Design a protein around this ligand. Structure first.
Ligand SMILES: [Mg+2]
Length: 446
């Protein structure tokens, strides 16, 4: 019937794609010259300088980089997860892949799948929709599609709804098992947006038959026209010998002000209340209590200077020197970078962060023009840098969780529209349980 559009889609939102993953995508691009390799990104949550460097390098590698916001694929639902301080990138990619495929067609792939064999110049899908029989379980990390395919469009709408209701997801039945073997985050991702969600949809849609179970698909029993290559053989195209499962702060959170973070939380909660009636106060309070080091790497433009931060000045010429400062009250105190070349160190200085930090700086190819990955690594070091010298330690004075919760409560419940839409508030904080009770009584008398 239809043909899979000649596009290969890869998604990496948040920080820059690791170089290992860039190499895999490059191979897919070289081995499949007839196909346009595209890496999808989100400019709203990405480090701008590093992203610009990446887009240029990808242009040199023959890889198209597209933004989800500019192409109209980021539904407000995906934007709600990406604007979270620690986003579940797995749920985001599981949702963006369906919207991207539905708008451009082509093949979605995970950057960990390697190309062993080039794809056919034309791939035909009797239903405009193909999956791989790899994994047993259902693989959602290889998906082929013709632009606008109805199945993909239905999945895209259904995943949105699943996500909206994610807070009512229970680890029951097949998920009860999986909670204990893989973890909570992982198991919930699979039920809400991943293969679990997908299985139920493909069952509901009749694409999978009576016999298939979530952990025993039985592809050999199914309609083979839904499978790449029209059979249950392992396709030649793919090969595989983690990232999204640990919750990491999205970029620059350490460099936002308390008030800006409060403001972001208030917007997200409003979304939650308006879509679900649920006020997950402690989720927000426990994100917002975390304050890692503020930091800036001095670029051509002059730096906005946060009190209590690190400022790193790159060198003028390649054989110039890096300089680091602890900014205290906009006063700049210069931390002594330990010499790493003369060696001649004492055993004390082996564990020293500053020495290890200097070593990292010395390994920059071009100190005047560092790569995105070099910038990324230095950033990462700065976020966690903790000298033995207490005088050069970032202080990171920050409100505790319960105070933050109190502030979020005041702001949300002072809005009469939101206040009246709240059905259920989650908080374990003793000072806030009676305020939640009071609102419950208020609602009870109307
Ligand atoms: Mg990712």
């Amino acid at each position: 019937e239809a043909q899979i559009d000649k596009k290969i889609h890869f998604i990496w939102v948040g920080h820059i794609m690791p170089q290992k993953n860039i190499q895999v995508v490059s191979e897919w691009a070289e081995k499949n010259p007839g196909y346009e390799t595209i890496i999808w990104v989100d400019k709203k949550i990405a480090p701008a300088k590093e992203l610009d460097l990446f887009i240029l390098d990808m242009k040199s590698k023959g890889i198209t980089v597209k933004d989800i916001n500019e192409e109209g694929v980021c539904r407000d639902s995906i934007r709600h997860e990406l604007d979270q301080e620690s986003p579940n990138y797995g749920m985001v990619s599981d949702m963006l892949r369906l919207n991207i495929l539905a708008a451009e067609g082509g093949i979605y792939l995970d950057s960990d799948i390697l190309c062993s064999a080039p794809f056919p110049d034309e791939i035909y899908a009797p239903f405009g929709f193909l999956l791989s029989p790899w994994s047993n379980t259902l693989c959602n990390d290889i998906i082929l599609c013709s632009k606008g395919n109805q199945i993909i469009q239905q999945l895209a709408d259904a995943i949105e709804q699943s996500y909206i209701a994610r807070d009512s997801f229970e680890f029951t039945h097949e998920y009860a098992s999986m909670k204990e073997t893989k973890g909570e985050r992982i198991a919930k991702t699979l039920g809400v947006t991943g293969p679990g969600f997908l299985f139920h949809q493909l069952k509901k849609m009749g694409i999978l038959n009576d016999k298939s179970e979530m952990e025993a698909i039985h592809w050999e029993l199914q309609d083979q026209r839904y499978l790449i290559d029209g059979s249950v053989k392992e396709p030649d195209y793919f090969y595989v010998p983690a990232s999204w499962v640990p919750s990491i702060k999205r970029p620059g959170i350490e460099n936002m002000s308390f008030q800006e973070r409060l403001e972001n939380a208030v917007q997200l909660i409003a979304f939650d209340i308006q879509k679900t009636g649920l006020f997950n106060l402690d989720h927000y309070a426990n994100e917002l209590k975390v304050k890692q080091n503020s930091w800036c790497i001095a670029a051509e433009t002059s730096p906005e200077l946060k009190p209590d931060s690190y400022l790193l000045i790159r060198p003028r010429d390649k054989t110039g020197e890096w300089t680091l400062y602890y900014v205290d009250e906009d006063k700049k105190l210069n931390p002594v970078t330990l010499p790493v070349i003369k060696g001649a160190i004492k055993l004390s200085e082996v564990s020293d962060p500053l020495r290890k930090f200097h070593t990292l700086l010395s390994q920059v190819s071009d100190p005047v023009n560092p790569t995105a990955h070099e910038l990324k690594q230095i950033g990462r070091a700065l976020i966690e840098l903790k000298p033995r010298q207490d005088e050069w330690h970032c202080k990171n004075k920050w409100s505790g969780a319960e105070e933050i919760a109190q502030e979020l409560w005041q702001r949300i419940t002072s809005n009469e529209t939101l206040r009246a839409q709240i059905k259920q508030c989650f908080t374990q904080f003793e000072s806030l349980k009676p305020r939640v009770a009071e609102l419950g009584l208020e609602h009870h008398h109307h």
